[PDB]
Amino acid sequence: EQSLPFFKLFSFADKFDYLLMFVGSLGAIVHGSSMPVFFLLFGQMVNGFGKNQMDLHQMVHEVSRYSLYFVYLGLVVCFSSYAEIACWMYSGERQVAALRKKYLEAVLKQDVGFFDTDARTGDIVFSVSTDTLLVQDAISEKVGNFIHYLSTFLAGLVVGFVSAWKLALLSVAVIPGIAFAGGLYAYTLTGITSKSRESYANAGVIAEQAIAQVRTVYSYVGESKALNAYSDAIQYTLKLGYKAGMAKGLGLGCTYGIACMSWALVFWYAGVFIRNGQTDGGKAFTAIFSAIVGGMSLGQSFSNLGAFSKGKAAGYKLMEIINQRPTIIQDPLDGKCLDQVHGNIEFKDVTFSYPSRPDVMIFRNFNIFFPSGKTVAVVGGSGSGKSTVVSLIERFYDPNSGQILLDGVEIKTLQLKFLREQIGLVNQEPALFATTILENILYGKPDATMVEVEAAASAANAHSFITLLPKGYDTQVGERGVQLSGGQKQRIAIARAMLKDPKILLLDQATSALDASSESIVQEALDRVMVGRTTVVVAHRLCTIRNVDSIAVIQQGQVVETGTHEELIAKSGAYASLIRFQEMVSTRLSHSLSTKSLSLRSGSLRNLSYSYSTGADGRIEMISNAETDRKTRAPENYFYRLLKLNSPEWPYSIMGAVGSILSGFIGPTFAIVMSNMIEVFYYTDYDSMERKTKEYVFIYIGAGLYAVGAYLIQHYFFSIMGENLTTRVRRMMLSAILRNEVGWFDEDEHNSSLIAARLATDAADVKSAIAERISVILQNMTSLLTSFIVAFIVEWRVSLLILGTFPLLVLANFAQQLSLKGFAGDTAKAHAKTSMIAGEGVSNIRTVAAFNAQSKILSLFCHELRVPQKRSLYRSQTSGFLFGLSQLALYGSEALILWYGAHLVSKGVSTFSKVIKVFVVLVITANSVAETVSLAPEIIRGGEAVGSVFSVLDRQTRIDPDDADADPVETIRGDIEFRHVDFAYPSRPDVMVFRDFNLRIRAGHSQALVGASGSGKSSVIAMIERFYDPLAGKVMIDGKDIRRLNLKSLRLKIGLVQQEPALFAATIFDNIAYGKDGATESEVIDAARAANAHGFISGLPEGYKTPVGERGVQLSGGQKQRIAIARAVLKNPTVLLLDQATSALDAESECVLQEALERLMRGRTTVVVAHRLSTIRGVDCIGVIQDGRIVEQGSHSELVSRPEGAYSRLLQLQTHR
Ligand SMILES: Nc1ncnc2c1ncn2[C@@H]1O[C@H](COP(=O)(O)OP(=O)(O)OP(=O)(O)O)[C@@H](O)[C@H]1O
Ligand SMILES: Nc1ncnc2c1ncn2[C@@H]1O[C@H](COP(=O)(O)OP(=O)(O)OP(=O)(O)O)[C@@H](O)[C@H]1O
Ligand SMILES: [Mg+2]
Ligand SMILES: [Mg+2]
């Protein structure tokens, strides 16, 4: 959408922020112009240390002077890298933490009708969680990196064009020659990676179907050919992944092969310009290296323009609510204030519709009257808009035509602090703000005294239940410290709505907890608060309204009938149908936020996003998404187990380890040939310098072709090894998911959107954990090792001093690589406790706006943004000082080497080019050792969260489909028998749907398990085949227990017909031959014409070939049912299972079932459940299930012969349509 400029993000800056962005913008320019000044001091040293080869007294006075200028260069990098980190991290905190205080003043003052849960308070909650962390990413510390490397470019050219300006043009013209082939590489690597993501989605839905339809893959045993259709469509991503390793070996060989053919260009013309008497060996070392590392420092300034475009998109969404004008506002002077109220509410000619869609008309000419000191009741039987009345006295909306008089005074002339001070609200599942249970009661009144809080808790049946809690009125209700965790809460709103002492009380449908004798406790507590108050009762069910003096009824836009409950039961006017209807009878925001966090979590950093959940019933819980540190949960032997799985490719690891050592010979050979030409440039024999610099250019060219052939071996191999592992792992993951029990799939984090991406993202990052972390170890440890053997043959007295310094030269190059990604780690973890206070002052704003609790959600937020500011003051002063102090041991220790080397030459021990060769080789080596120790924790710290997918391999199923020590099944005649069995669901173990259940189904009979409004009726077929095991008891089948048999050899002769039949994405020739392996045309045509649909199946364009499940032709609910019966007649089972429930007919003119329900049962033992009391006249036997028991058994001549029982009550519901 629209976007702000890059400025106006700095509009929350006070006068102390214009001082930290000025001291912190001299620290970014002085630290920038220090690497092109290091090349000016190290260049002028070599002129003093190497022109004086004949006078060893002029040497020592000109190396002792320039090695004092490195200690002076250290103190200017120490005190100016301190000033760009300690001043841009703390000034980027104080600006975003005053954006949070004005965005929350803005989102507490908009109208309450703005938040109607229609993905509106799932965007406000997301904009306070993540859009505020994108402004802080953009303006804090990636602005210091923008000024640092831009001024390294501008200072790298001025040092370059002053020393030697001809060599500063040959070294800049080379830079397009390197960035072209280093940028054309990155184009042709995304062109393979994007085709890999495209060629995977053919196999991305075959894994997806077998998880979301797992009950059908088990009943028809085809869990061994959901692998063979998944092991074929991965073989086109393996082969396309072989040529994304060759396009990297040719992309790094031909990028290191042009740079090596460009040091042969700049060091040949330097050898011509010295012989002409124009330069020397220190003005040319300066000019070449200052213009190369200066021009390369524009790839790091422009790397920050990606975060600068996220911080302008996110920052506009926040800045369009901060200055948004609401409608229903407070006027402190243009608003009256009455006294001695009485509570006479009257809607005089009010019409109103919700502003989400003005098409409907809820309140067409609405007219009521609420007396003083009395009780009323507003009741309906459908969506009549009776909860809208209590959502309109609060002024959450406006009546767009009409007026509302309070004691004859219009409420639009009263401000919104006198109206809401006299009205108290109680609503559904009341707001429990995550504080103690003294602070929640003190929202109705802030502080009067202590004894009134106990007095309000006394007359609510609330005093005893907070004294059987071993803490003194101080209990965490948000987190489960001490659990008042009953479904019957104490409705502590009633404790709030008594301490406030309102004159008008707006109750609501407060029977929403499956009411019983437990919920009758607060029923009389409501009868002890509705005294002397003009209260209303919005009643959902009429069973609790039966003692109310006056009741009004609305049906369509207006009131219909009023009066007491004697003429209400009389005359049958629009109330007798409602009492007939009484006889015949959040966790969603977390799914909205995580899918909004989906497709925005592969590009965004893991320390900048969240992951959402439900938590307890106190708040929405936010995990900082850098939980990989606190998890630390992989097996201790995970690195050997991923090598045992990756062994058949042992030739493709030996032939890549003689390609990773040969790449470690290119680095330490560049630093020998380049440090042999510093020596040669100080010759005075201008013909023996020409013929010895032709032989140092030919090495640069000949080893610029060695680099092409030694990165093609390292990266074509180790990609054959690493793409036969992510193919082998994904097959071992799907073959282990489709072996677990059914109840494992029923949980909330095992749905088919977080479990089919673990095979797509968490299974393809095992390549960069055991193949791309060996290639950069064999390479970097044969470069460290070949440069401590050469450098102890040349000279061992200087290189033993560098060996004692070497922990300090690798610690300074380790801090220079953490600074490319910033020193303000995991910034989403400190801003998690502060965000949940805004994350529940928005989703509970219907109770925040009531009680006038708006100035307390803001003072629990300004008083609690002080914790991440003292965490970001101590972290910026420390990390900014330890960075600059470790840059002082990098320049103050290269001045100890070059001084001790100059002392050996003047005593006649060493020579020139024995100190420079030892210096250049052992310093460039130190820049590679601090890359190996940067990936050193992740090898120990369990890989990471994506390399920790062993929980699908190392997991023990409860129901094992295949056993060797199990009896094989040859014939089941059908002997279904249930012994004393009770059962519950593992997803919710409190409900006890079965209680000593018993059946006995003889062979050659049927069964007609009755509806009974869902008394556990579609759970008997879920134990005939083991979708769930019982808690206690035995399931008897063929005179044997069911937990003794080969499960795969039992499910191929028990075939069900699903509740809502689903079809795979294929033709109607596989979906009618998935129930029998090997049938082609012989019994397939006959399997059509048994539940026939033959004109439906011959009337079709390509014969029996059309996609019907996904991305194909659409069928109806009556025709999909016809296909699933064709499976069950092709398979020809012995035990048949049917399942129909909860209005699943979905088609008038019922003929899709009447043909199949009588032909199919002629030789089988069938079990039939149907929710309607029609077409269920199975004349063998019929039983009734109630609360986990059978109550009556016998055919349909001993079932209606009893006068009532329980069956004839259901016979009354036949005429109740
Ligand atoms: N944000 C909204 N947009 C459109 N329609 C709404 C919105 N909120 C509520 N409604 C409608 O208002 C009606 C309110 O019905 P009613 O007053 O009888 O309350 P209820 O359905 O008994 O109880 P509850 O309000 O708890 O569902 C609903 O049928 C619903 O369709
Ligand atoms: N996997 C499950 N998860 C949660 N609750 C279940 C599960 N299976 C059964 N139940 C509970 O047990 C009862 C099952 O009754 P049954 O499924 O036989 O018919 P039904 O519930 O009327 O049909 P439907 O399940 O299609 O609504 C339901 O009320 C449900 O609350
Ligand atoms: Mg509703
Ligand atoms: Mg159900």
UniProtKB/Swiss-Prot annotation:
Effect of mutating F289A: Increased ATPase activity and enhanced activity stimulation by brassinolide, but reduced brassinosteroid exporter activity
Q: What does its PTM field state?
A: Phosphorylated by PHOT1 in phototropic seedlings, to modulates auxin export and distribution and regulates leaf and petiole curling.
Activity regulation description: Transport capacity is stimulated by the chaperone protein FKBP42/TWD1. ATPase activity is specifically activated by bioactive brassinosteroids in a dose-dependent manner, including brassinolide (BL), 24-epiBL and 24-epicastasterone (24-epiCS). Inhibited by vanadate.
Q: Which residues are glycosylated?
A: N607, N724, N751, N780
Q: Where does ATP 2 bind?
A: D746, Y985, S987, R988, K1017, S1018, S1019
The primary site where this protein sits is membrane
Effect the entry attributes to changing I924A: Strongly reduced ATPase activity and lost activity stimulation by brassinolide
Give compartment(s): Cell membrane
The keyword Protease is annotated on this UniProt entry: no
| Protein family (similarity comment) | Belongs to the ABC transporter superfamily. ABCB family. Multidrug resistance exporter (TC 3.A.1.201) subfamily.
Spell out the subunit comment: Interacts with 1-naphthylphthalamic acid (NPA), and FKBP42/TWD1.
What's the protein here called? ABC transporter B family member 19
Q: Which gene encodes it?
A: ABCB19
